[PDB]
Each structure stands twice: as C-alpha cells, then as structure tokens.
C-alpha cells in the first residue's frame, strides 16, 4: 500500500537538541517555510495527521485538510520530554540509537510505540499522506531495513509493509 | 512481508539428540558464541522471541530486546521431553516424520502447535526478526514448500507468506 509519511517542520527544540514527544510546541518560521515547500510536492491523496499542532500546521501549509489521529503522534518520552539529547543517560541514548529496549518512566515503551504505529498503518484501506513525527517515520524506515532518520519537513513514500519507494527532501 | 526466523543457539540436548520443547534449558558456551555471531548479520527489525531462556538469551547476545510471546515456543513434547530421538518409539517417530498428526502424552498436539504459530505469524503488522525454535522454523519453511535444514544459531529470511528470501547458516 503506497503511503507517504511526512515529518513535520522544525520547532525550536530541533536546533536545541531536546526530545520532543507529546510536548506541544509550535513550528518556527523556518518550520513553516519547510511546510510551504511541500505544497505541490506531495500527491493529492487523503490526508491523516497527528493531532499535535506542529503536525496539523505542516499539513495545512502543505495544502491539506487532514483527519486527526493521536495514533500518529511521536513516542511519549514521559519524564524524558524536553531532556537534552547531549546529557541523556548512555542507556537511553543507546536504546534510542539501536531503537530497542526503551521504556522511559511515565512514558511509552518503544515496543508499545511500534504496535501503535503499525496498528494504525494496518488499518489504512487506501493510499494516503500521513503528517507525523520523526520517530514514526524512523520506526517505519527501520522496519523496512533502512536508516530511519529524515530532516524536518521532509517526506518518504513506502509500499507498506514491503519497501521504501522514495525519500523527498526540499531546499 | 520480511520475516527472519532465527533458531536459538545450541543447548546440551541438541548435541545429545534429545527432544527439546518446553524444557527450559540454557545455551551452552558454543550456543552463546553462535548467538553473538548473529549480531553482525541480522537486520535491525522489530524483534520478538519465544519466552524460553535459550531463545531470550540468543536474542540478547544477537543485540536485540524482543517482545516475548509463548506462541513462538517449540511444541510441548509432554512426557517425551528429553527423550532420545534415536530410541523414540516408532509410533511417535513415524507420527513426527509423517507430519499428518501428533499428540504426545501430557503434551501438545501438532494442530494446537500450528494454530498457535500461524495465528502469531498472521498477526504480525510489520517486518520482524523472530527468535524461536527448530520446529517453528521448520513449520514456516514447509508452509513455503521447502525442507527444514536450519542448524542451531542459524536463520532463514522469508517474504511471508510467499517464499524464502535467503538462508543464513554461520
């Protein structure tokens, strides 16, 4: 099933290097700029978006009017929300880097996050554009055997659950 | 959808030739070495594992933190757990070789085993690495029209439920 996943534009915490999950921060000026560049670059398919403001705003500026689903949210970092990546305990860094065995206190485990995301993707009955977050795109890319790190405001199209079709980045 | 079926490393009953199902044996030193060797080959896909110690330990040494599922367990041989294959009564040996039916005393039936394994596989929602047992790997290979020559600590990748992608015997 052809699915286009879009990572929302940047927020201040991208440059600041802080974990941003369920914390609701707005797009920066550049983030809105990145979002506008997506208009006319994404297929005119039904759109779905995380309910987080930054995701919804990206969809809007991209020319879409998506249906909202919290299932498309970034992983819930719990007590690690807002924590600087730099000072993150090596155990957490490793868990996130290897994408496994991550269970932040007060948050969502990586295993639970993957189930949520993959369960949502399984329910899609037709090609769609999904406005979501870096961790969601990463989970999908890694499940498809590829490095799952993509720039804010970029997109990837996949033939779920078989292979990646294209990675789209705009300058 | 890509699935990697990984057979746990060897235990003492493998070299001794004894039926090993729900008996929770640990890996031997060589079994652990086999597990470590898998770290440099298996793709970093979501991982799942039988809850048996030998499977869990194989996953850990291969560099994974799997979600545990008893559905990935080898069949329960009941009273036949630990029985030497070489002296297995013809009634059971034939049953296991015919693949038409099997139900050892105090054990699990082939039918229950299959319901178990296939329900699990059919429920997967994304590619994955599955740390399991010989009987499970064999069940998958046979469902794809292939034999089942996968030694301990080795793996087979399949495009489920269509065909085998590649075999990895280290």
UniProtKB/TrEMBL annotation, chain A:
Keywords: Glycolysis, Isomerase, Plasmid. Transmembrane segments: none annotated. GO terms for cellular component: cytoplasm. InterPro entries: His_Pase_superF_clade-1, His_PPase_superfam, PG/BPGM_mutase_AS, PGM_Phosphatase. The keyword Isomerase applies. It comes from the Bacteria. Substrate binds at residues 7-14, 54. GO terms for molecular function: phosphatase activity. SMART domains: PGAM (SM00855). This is Alpha-ribazole-5'-phosphate phosphatase. PROSITE patterns: PG_MUTASE (PS00175).
